[PDB]
């Protein structure tokens, strides 16, 4: 698996690939690993699929309920804190997952959450077996002064590099852009393919 | 064990073989591994037989209850979510199964569900020990434009090849076709046998 | 890894892919796994790279020596028996390999040799983590009456299928054809790429 | 694997199937498990393929040598004793095999030899994972007064029954008959095939 | 232990031997392993004696209760399903048993149930350490067209063969015949003894 | 540790960092991991220091010996084969190392060699705990058309990114350029630092 | 991790670095490890991030509640005792943390609390993988007569030295000073950078 | 144990404490851990006493022999390389030691050598359980410009701080200074005590 | 740790040192290990700090409660019996401690209580890793006739000898004397130092 | 076991008890543990009796041979070094002993040697299970100014105290005094008894 979330001045971009393996065995080429969980909030999943899919359903339900109760979206940090508490509670019988939570409240945020509920905010973050490959690209090429368009190109580059070197990563790249103006937008896959072609990439 | 599920334009095809082993010991040549669990919903089982059979009984009961209560059939993705929740709830004392849920609501769907409740939708999928052989045949021969008759032939060819190479697979091939017109329909044995003869195959 | 050997009327066709992994980490995209070891003899390797490469060097050397001493090529069955004896000798400290030996003496032969020196002749055979997918394709598609050109297409198709479903397989497909008339001939890469386009495949 | 040896009044009949597996994976459908090792002596092999193949080569070598040196064939019991000595000598680094040794010296004999060199003569014997099924058929149906053609049908019946119930057994049945008049005679496949039809069986 | 159940046209025949061991130590020569549990229903027991005896008491109790409540006998399949549910419910603290359930409802049925509640219907089935020998005899000799007296001789033949080769099987053979006309009928020992003589057997 | 070797048109560039840790404990900040071992041959070391240092000493000794005896430099492929043979011969008592061998004979070559003596040629390679980060950068930014100055910048960037994300990597970057015109030249430290500044980097 | 707390005449100084690793992998460079938990009370964390973070939330909640209820701040010794009771209660299912609690009531205090609730007051203390390096610097350079400006330099020095030798420590140094006059005050990053520059340090 | 070696312009300074423990048990308060092994070469020992004492005797013997044979002292790097080869050779039955080798040839050197024979030169180094405390002092206080008197003080400070925090370190500090002019000079206890008294320290 | 309690005619004397370790690591030099728990009752602690501190708080609380309820101090034997019952009750999840309880009721008492709640009265006792050294001093030098001044000296001697040979013992010696006339009296540090100086000792 | 060796101005005193146990079982009350091994050299043994006794025989043989060969006694340090070499050589198949070697050459010496050949000179030392009690007494009561009469009393006291607290120590105390004037002299039992009586002791 490879997932990434980056912050820019007024945006969060989150992306994953789609391969689902059991050891060497590529069972699914198009699993889904990037979810909208609230108006300006996205989540990526890595680790054990069953555990992660249950968390996605919970987060969808709880953030929708919180919004109804509070008349405002849960702050991004509050999402990360909720998950932190839920995961640490079952520490010794854990959800075996790595999560990224990204969103916009008054500012863009990316939080990385581990299976013991450790939660840390970052400028960018990657999860899954492909993540070290992504950190290479990001360390080398990321800039805070990037535009959304360059940010989208960077994450495609980073996940494409990870797909080349991580056999547990593969398939189409899903990208979402989150802004206050347009909200959470999953980019059309034809737009991703066009960017892929132009950047000179394969698979 | 070998099971398969494929989607076509407006149909789902499900098939299995029937061998029940304890190690090398073929105890039963005609076990049943393919089940109707709702009007337009079928399920295959692989793994521990007592676990899988309990799941089949539950799913029959719950899907009948749901549609009496709702006056509509549970959507296929809802069937997969339900199982996903049940299986994950007990992941540290699991149903030791792999499941295929296939059916048609507004569209055809095949879902693959593992012992921890991970559930992934696919265009086609296969489970059991014979499954890598099936995936070989399907990678090579599947087309999204196949007719129902061609799909039926494809799954027969795929299971027959798994039977030639997987000693834990054998016996007669059970096939069911699911359409909006007829619902879930298990094909007559004599029809499967006629297709086996006319494809130049064995068993 | 995926390798395959098939016999036809007066030919042997052997093919591999080129991916070298360290668990999930794709270290090399272009390893070599198919070797000419004598005038009409080839060998494919799967398993521990260092063990397999040492065996390739031995075999090249011993068969060169043998033909100098005997003034005729080592018979294919003799090659397989030599290897069988060598590998069984060290059964408790083994070469952790699966080998295919293919070639022509008075007739085409493919031998499959395991890490304990078990050696069996077959009309076709496959090794590596991708082999069950190949076995699927060959069970449904292989025919004794195939021509060389259709045999070459069959192995490209089989390995293309393995690569789609085995994350430990990947890279360019290497093919050699062995005949009495032409000797051992590795097909040029651009011919393999041409066949991949015309058959409708990826990479 | 299933092998069988029976003694009759002035005859030994020896038979096997031909399936070679790694776990559930049927690698070869036509392995060879029945060998002539001397003028009036046959041997069947079960267990680890590389070990058993080495023993077959050694036995063919040594009984040939002994014959040339003694100017008489090694007595069947001396054959079983040589093997007994060889296997016991390496009990702690064993040949992981079960052997039947059958033939005519001044009388029909069948010997059954284990991986520690334990050797016992019997009127009939069976080895491999399919042998419990064979013992069933033989207990029920064997008679010392049977003729060769009856003996032949018996072993075919016994191995067919084993193939039905032992997933590690399969493939064509090989039968040899050993007499002082005709020596060791492997029966032609068409003749085995014809007896399978007239007995009412399969494969 | 050896038990067997066969279906015939309008009959079920069920049989056991009677040996009860702790390891090699024959404690009892005449244990009872065949029980009537309903008007037209029998059950055989194999595995841990205390577990199987508790299940026999429960089944006699519950089928009697159910009969009084429903005013019809529990259908044979419902019997196998009840057991399936019960055994699976305690899979992690199991009844360490193998069960055969046989009888007449609108047709003859034999069900084989394992320690995890896996339950499969078959035309015939065998349990216990002696069952591989029985499967041999049945594969070779069973015919759906047999009469009851032929069916009876068959099971006697099969268990005698098992007693010859399974040291954990022994003692007198108990046979029951179940029909709609005569109900469940345990055959008198003298009648079993007389058939053993005329078939040419022992014990 | 982080090492990298890349090939260019007529050049090899090899680089490392210098951190020697004992778990978390940074013992030495300036260990040497890049060595000239022949006139146009460099080696990098990763893994157990004492093992790697012994192999460095052997290789300097043996390539000097060989050059003197043959009156030509050992071909790069022969250096890797030599290592491959040595490492494989002791694979059950191994040198716990990963080595890169790079240089120029008639062409530039980089070889990667593992602790079992598996040796593979590549256009580029990286070893050590920091290597995944390096592969990310190389995948994204490597081009076969780069000039030497560009290639020197690439490896500084790749190693700098690894140092940022791999706590077992750190210290000054060592770089060697190997050409037929100039031989093996270690770039002066002042020059690496200069490129570090100009590229916008640290350490 | 490296954290430190020192007492002076009427002051407490607490500092940490910010590196978050999973083994050698630097996930976050700017994690937070020093928190104000009450008006005149701070806390540092080390060990499992999820456990520590939950404990930070509890202490902020409980120290606020206590003060509301008591109309005075919890004494620092009472904070340490509360923690010590909570950690000891769950010592067989522990919070896997080392904690520093520092503050001012009628006097300055630093307490060190382990995962089993053992709690000891000291004049200074350090926790995490970097703490032995820190104790080196403090043993050599701590004086009870130091001014707040001096103690601030001292902890910057301690932590800087730890970051040079502990690869699990890194990133910006955080520092808070606690006094009766100003309460708990976090020093601005620009002031710590200026002091790192003035003292002649790096990282 | 605590040992330390530092280089200055034209000097090496080496120092240890003297505590010999068996777990918590202080067997000897006055062991010796610093040895002159050649005219301008000293060695410190840490780890298993028996192993380290044997190595001291070998080194003294071999360096004396070598000086006699070569008519020059073994270069310090040669001493470290000798130890490297020796320790690596017995890697699987190791001397369980950490060594510092210090001396002057054409320049001052300190080498650190581990139990697998990994050997690294540094400006300074420490070994033993007390070494982390020493690294803290040196990182904070070491200067390459220091005079001999200042370096002597530094190492006393460093060892004194280690003694305060490491219960396996204790007893009198031994110090030797090595120069070209004066040779290896072990400083009189009275002089070290006077410095411990002057610098304001303990023990 | 070293603790000691001795009885004299009309007095109890109790003493500890103050070292708190984590293996070799001296975390705290000044921990407290001797506590007054009632008017004429003291307690020393050894073993796991968290567990021992929790027990100190319970004892102080319960003995105060009991004094309020009964209007007499709990008898020393009752205090030991209370601890006995408490510790024994949680035997399988124990407080991992060694306790001394000392005091005066109608007579002086010292009790020693283990982690399973075994409790024994003695004339004197010691606990901790330093206790064997203490038993040596007491056996040689203890007299029942000693005065308080002499007993104070004895225990200082005893603890000082333990500190010299036990690296897990260290720091200032705390002493309390308990009498009917004066109550529990913790001796001023200055007085203990004066005795350490007078008696000719260290630390 | 308890053994002790002390040095005085011109004297060595060595003593042991005599108890031999197998766990709690006192097999021998009067075993021997102190031996003269050369004119002015004694040795005590502790640990496995058979290992110790073989070592006593070797040292008596070798020290006699050496003296015959050298015409002088082996220096005590040379004795300790010899032992240290021998024990270290076999450290992975060790003599499971603790040894004291004491004697007079130009000065008195006591050396303590462990099972891995670690050897350290000290002013006094003790070995065996009773040694911690002994170190208690010696720390408190040893003086370098003692006379031989005083040191003899001191070791009787040390050992008597050990016998009171160590159940694996017991029986008569053996004592030897070593001087230049009289050599090694074993004290008569009547003299030790008289001193035990005079000092006020038991056992």
PDB file of C-alpha atoms in Angstrom, chain C residues 89-197:
ATOM      1  CA  UNK C  89      23.839 -35.007  -2.100  1.00  0.00           C
ATOM      2  CA  UNK C  90      23.412 -31.766  -0.155  1.00  0.00           C
ATOM      3  CA  UNK C  91      19.701 -32.352   0.710  1.00  0.00           C
ATOM      4  CA  UNK C  92      20.288 -31.252   4.368  1.00  0.00           C
ATOM      5  CA  UNK C  93      22.307 -28.111   3.358  1.00  0.00           C
ATOM      6  CA  UNK C  94      20.480 -27.397   0.094  1.00  0.00           C
ATOM      7  CA  UNK C  95      20.573 -25.205  -2.961  1.00  0.00           C
ATOM      8  CA  UNK C  96      17.216 -23.518  -2.299  1.00  0.00           C
ATOM      9  CA  UNK C  97      16.160 -23.593  -5.978  1.00  0.00           C
ATOM     10  CA  UNK C  98      13.635 -24.897  -8.517  1.00  0.00           C
ATOM     11  CA  UNK C  99      15.170 -25.544 -11.888  1.00  0.00           C
ATOM     12  CA  UNK C 100      13.863 -26.231 -15.366  1.00  0.00           C
ATOM     13  CA  UNK C 101      16.145 -27.955 -17.828  1.00  0.00           C
ATOM     14  CA  UNK C 102      15.057 -27.941 -21.459  1.00  0.00           C
ATOM     15  CA  UNK C 103      16.504 -29.052 -24.744  1.00  0.00           C
ATOM     16  CA  UNK C 104      16.804 -31.382 -27.712  1.00  0.00           C
ATOM     17  CA  UNK C 105      18.761 -34.563 -28.198  1.00  0.00           C
ATOM     18  CA  UNK C 106      16.926 -37.142 -30.402  1.00  0.00           C
ATOM     19  CA  UNK C 107      13.710 -35.511 -29.122  1.00  0.00           C
ATOM     20  CA  UNK C 108      12.524 -32.421 -27.137  1.00  0.00           C
ATOM     21  CA  UNK C 109      12.572 -32.600 -23.291  1.00  0.00           C
ATOM     22  CA  UNK C 110      11.659 -30.445 -20.346  1.00  0.00           C
ATOM     23  CA  UNK C 111      12.755 -31.480 -16.845  1.00  0.00           C
ATOM     24  CA  UNK C 112      11.667 -29.986 -13.596  1.00  0.00           C
ATOM     25  CA  UNK C 113      14.145 -30.353 -10.683  1.00  0.00           C
ATOM     26  CA  UNK C 114      13.464 -29.538  -6.990  1.00  0.00           C
ATOM     27  CA  UNK C 115      15.800 -28.593  -4.076  1.00  0.00           C
ATOM     28  CA  UNK C 116      16.103 -32.260  -2.969  1.00  0.00           C
ATOM     29  CA  UNK C 117      17.053 -33.430  -6.503  1.00  0.00           C
ATOM     30  CA  UNK C 118      13.627 -34.753  -7.406  1.00  0.00           C
ATOM     31  CA  UNK C 119      13.569 -34.682 -11.173  1.00  0.00           C
ATOM     32  CA  UNK C 120      10.540 -35.350 -13.352  1.00  0.00           C
ATOM     33  CA  UNK C 121      10.068 -35.098 -17.123  1.00  0.00           C
ATOM     34  CA  UNK C 122       6.943 -33.334 -18.346  1.00  0.00           C
ATOM     35  CA  UNK C 123       5.433 -32.032 -21.607  1.00  0.00           C
ATOM     36  CA  UNK C 124       5.280 -28.642 -19.913  1.00  0.00           C
ATOM     37  CA  UNK C 125       6.294 -27.182 -16.543  1.00  0.00           C
ATOM     38  CA  UNK C 126       6.446 -23.977 -14.601  1.00  0.00           C
ATOM     39  CA  UNK C 127       8.455 -22.704 -11.567  1.00  0.00           C
ATOM     40  CA  UNK C 128       8.466 -19.747  -9.194  1.00  0.00           C
ATOM     41  CA  UNK C 129       5.799 -17.895  -7.245  1.00  0.00           C
ATOM     42  CA  UNK C 130       3.952 -17.132 -10.529  1.00  0.00           C
ATOM     43  CA  UNK C 131       3.757 -20.774 -11.622  1.00  0.00           C
ATOM     44  CA  UNK C 132       0.178 -21.640 -10.516  1.00  0.00           C
ATOM     45  CA  UNK C 133      -1.109 -18.806 -12.758  1.00  0.00           C
ATOM     46  CA  UNK C 134       0.925 -20.260 -15.691  1.00  0.00           C
ATOM     47  CA  UNK C 135      -0.406 -23.751 -14.966  1.00  0.00           C
ATOM     48  CA  UNK C 136      -3.947 -22.273 -15.269  1.00  0.00           C
ATOM     49  CA  UNK C 137      -3.239 -20.761 -18.695  1.00  0.00           C
ATOM     50  CA  UNK C 138      -1.433 -23.916 -19.967  1.00  0.00           C
ATOM     51  CA  UNK C 139      -4.151 -26.271 -18.752  1.00  0.00           C
ATOM     52  CA  UNK C 140      -6.828 -24.425 -20.787  1.00  0.00           C
ATOM     53  CA  UNK C 141      -4.724 -23.418 -23.804  1.00  0.00           C
ATOM     54  CA  UNK C 142      -1.746 -25.707 -24.397  1.00  0.00           C
ATOM     55  CA  UNK C 143      -1.882 -28.105 -27.307  1.00  0.00           C
ATOM     56  CA  UNK C 144       0.774 -30.655 -28.442  1.00  0.00           C
ATOM     57  CA  UNK C 145      -0.010 -29.682 -32.097  1.00  0.00           C
ATOM     58  CA  UNK C 146       0.934 -26.011 -31.656  1.00  0.00           C
ATOM     59  CA  UNK C 147       3.520 -24.514 -33.968  1.00  0.00           C
ATOM     60  CA  UNK C 148       6.532 -22.667 -32.595  1.00  0.00           C
ATOM     61  CA  UNK C 149       4.902 -19.272 -33.253  1.00  0.00           C
ATOM     62  CA  UNK C 150       1.797 -20.197 -31.305  1.00  0.00           C
ATOM     63  CA  UNK C 151       3.867 -21.819 -28.530  1.00  0.00           C
ATOM     64  CA  UNK C 152       5.806 -18.537 -28.208  1.00  0.00           C
ATOM     65  CA  UNK C 153       2.511 -16.621 -27.928  1.00  0.00           C
ATOM     66  CA  UNK C 154       1.247 -19.118 -25.311  1.00  0.00           C
ATOM     67  CA  UNK C 155       4.236 -18.613 -22.959  1.00  0.00           C
ATOM     68  CA  UNK C 156       4.029 -14.799 -23.392  1.00  0.00           C
ATOM     69  CA  UNK C 157       0.373 -14.994 -22.467  1.00  0.00           C
ATOM     70  CA  UNK C 158       1.034 -17.344 -19.537  1.00  0.00           C
ATOM     71  CA  UNK C 159       3.809 -15.148 -18.030  1.00  0.00           C
ATOM     72  CA  UNK C 160       1.772 -11.993 -18.721  1.00  0.00           C
ATOM     73  CA  UNK C 161      -1.005 -13.573 -16.629  1.00  0.00           C
ATOM     74  CA  UNK C 162       1.466 -14.536 -13.784  1.00  0.00           C
ATOM     75  CA  UNK C 163       2.794 -10.948 -13.762  1.00  0.00           C
ATOM     76  CA  UNK C 164      -0.732  -9.555 -13.342  1.00  0.00           C
ATOM     77  CA  UNK C 165      -1.372 -11.688 -10.232  1.00  0.00           C
ATOM     78  CA  UNK C 166       2.052 -12.331  -8.697  1.00  0.00           C
ATOM     79  CA  UNK C 167       3.739  -9.246  -7.241  1.00  0.00           C
ATOM     80  CA  UNK C 168       7.074 -11.150  -7.123  1.00  0.00           C
ATOM     81  CA  UNK C 169       7.028 -11.440 -10.967  1.00  0.00           C
ATOM     82  CA  UNK C 170       7.475  -8.584 -13.402  1.00  0.00           C
ATOM     83  CA  UNK C 171       9.728  -6.993 -16.006  1.00  0.00           C
ATOM     84  CA  UNK C 172      10.394  -7.957 -19.618  1.00  0.00           C
ATOM     85  CA  UNK C 173       9.622 -11.490 -20.799  1.00  0.00           C
ATOM     86  CA  UNK C 174      12.686 -13.423 -22.017  1.00  0.00           C
ATOM     87  CA  UNK C 175      12.102 -16.237 -24.521  1.00  0.00           C
ATOM     88  CA  UNK C 176      14.334 -18.804 -26.079  1.00  0.00           C
ATOM     89  CA  UNK C 177      13.396 -21.419 -28.737  1.00  0.00           C
ATOM     90  CA  UNK C 178      15.478 -24.557 -29.068  1.00  0.00           C
ATOM     91  CA  UNK C 179      15.567 -26.650 -32.292  1.00  0.00           C
ATOM     92  CA  UNK C 180      17.968 -29.073 -33.902  1.00  0.00           C
ATOM     93  CA  UNK C 181      18.038 -26.946 -37.031  1.00  0.00           C
ATOM     94  CA  UNK C 182      18.568 -23.532 -35.407  1.00  0.00           C
ATOM     95  CA  UNK C 183      20.145 -24.372 -32.036  1.00  0.00           C
ATOM     96  CA  UNK C 184      19.311 -22.347 -28.936  1.00  0.00           C
ATOM     97  CA  UNK C 185      17.893 -19.009 -29.998  1.00  0.00           C
ATOM     98  CA  UNK C 186      16.960 -16.206 -27.666  1.00  0.00           C
ATOM     99  CA  UNK C 187      14.256 -14.111 -29.278  1.00  0.00           C
ATOM    100  CA  UNK C 188      15.105 -10.422 -29.726  1.00  0.00           C
ATOM    101  CA  UNK C 189      13.327  -8.145 -27.244  1.00  0.00           C
ATOM    102  CA  UNK C 190      11.608  -6.141 -29.975  1.00  0.00           C
ATOM    103  CA  UNK C 191      10.072  -9.351 -31.339  1.00  0.00           C
ATOM    104  CA  UNK C 192       8.719 -10.142 -27.819  1.00  0.00           C
ATOM    105  CA  UNK C 193       7.332  -6.556 -27.555  1.00  0.00           C
ATOM    106  CA  UNK C 194       5.719  -6.908 -30.989  1.00  0.00           C
ATOM    107  CA  UNK C 195       4.000 -10.143 -29.900  1.00  0.00           C
ATOM    108  CA  UNK C 196       2.799  -8.427 -26.663  1.00  0.00           C
ATOM    109  CA  UNK C 197       1.102  -5.583 -28.619  1.00  0.00           C
TER     110      UNK C 197
END
